[PDB]
Amino acid sequence: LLGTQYISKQEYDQALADAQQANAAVTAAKAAVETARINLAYTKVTSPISGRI
Amino acid sequence: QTVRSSFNNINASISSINAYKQAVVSAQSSLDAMEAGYSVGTRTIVDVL
């Protein structure tokens, strides 16, 4: 809708604000899963090296 | 008064056209903001019609 300039150029960037910040929120939640996925590598306690136990 | 009425009607009615010729260009832009706005989905079919 701005190839043919039919919305504002402002309302686009404002939605592109919301696009880019919400994808910056997923990265701030995919890391938050990666915080809590790594608790489930910290459960099931992985032998951090090899060798004899 | 009759001659100047028509001569000042037609000088109005030229500008009346260039008003409502722009009012088409407004509404033809507003229609095409809908047909592009409905083909992608932001505006509905009744906001088109």
Swiss-Prot record, chain A:
Null mutant phenotype: Cannot grow on efflux substrates novobiocin or fusidic acid.
UniProt-annotated location(s): Cell inner membrane
Transmembrane spans: none
Family: Belongs to the membrane fusion protein (MFP) (TC 8.A.1) family.
Biological function: AcrA-AcrB-AcrZ-TolC is a drug efflux protein complex with broad substrate specificity that uses the proton motive force to export substrates. This subunit may act as an adapter protein that links AcrB and TolC stably together. It is elongated in shape, being long enough to span the periplasm.
Subunit structure of this chain's protein: Monomeric in solution. Homotrimeric; interacts independently with AcrB and TolC as well as AcrZ. Part of the AcrA-AcrB-TolC efflux pump. Complex assembly is independent of an efflux substrate and appears to be constitutive.
Protein name: Multidrug efflux pump subunit AcrA
Species in which this protein is naturally found: Escherichia coli (strain K12)
Lineage per the UniProt record: Bacteria, Pseudomonadati, Pseudomonadota, Gammaproteobacteria, Enterobacterales
Stretch of the intact protein here: 132 to 184 of 397
Swiss-Prot record, chain B:
Family per similarity comment: Belongs to the outer membrane factor (OMF) (TC 1.B.17) family.
Identification of the protein by name: Outer membrane protein TolC
Coiled-coil boundaries: none
Full protein: residues contained: 347 to 395 of 493
Domain notes per entry: Forms a continuous, solvent-accessible conduit: a 'channel-tunnel' over 140 Angstroms long that spans both the outer membrane and periplasmic space. The periplasmic or proximal end of the tunnel is sealed by sets of coiled helices.
Phenotype of the disrupted gene, per the record: Cannot grow on efflux substrates novobiocin or fusidic acid.
Subunit: Homotrimer. Part of tripartite efflux systems, which are composed of an inner membrane transporter, a periplasmic membrane fusion protein, and an outer membrane component, TolC. The complexes form a large protein conduit and can translocate molecules across both the inner and outer membranes. TolC interacts with the membrane fusion proteins AcrA, EmrA and MacA.
Annotated consequence of substituting D47A: Decreases inhibition by hexaamminecobalt(3+)
Function: Outer membrane channel, which is required for the function of several efflux systems such as AcrAB-TolC, AcrEF-TolC, EmrAB-TolC and MacAB-TolC. These systems are involved in export of antibiotics and other toxic compounds from the cell. TolC is also involved in import of colicin E1 into the cells.
Locations listed in the record: Cell outer membrane
Species of origin: Escherichia coli (strain K12)
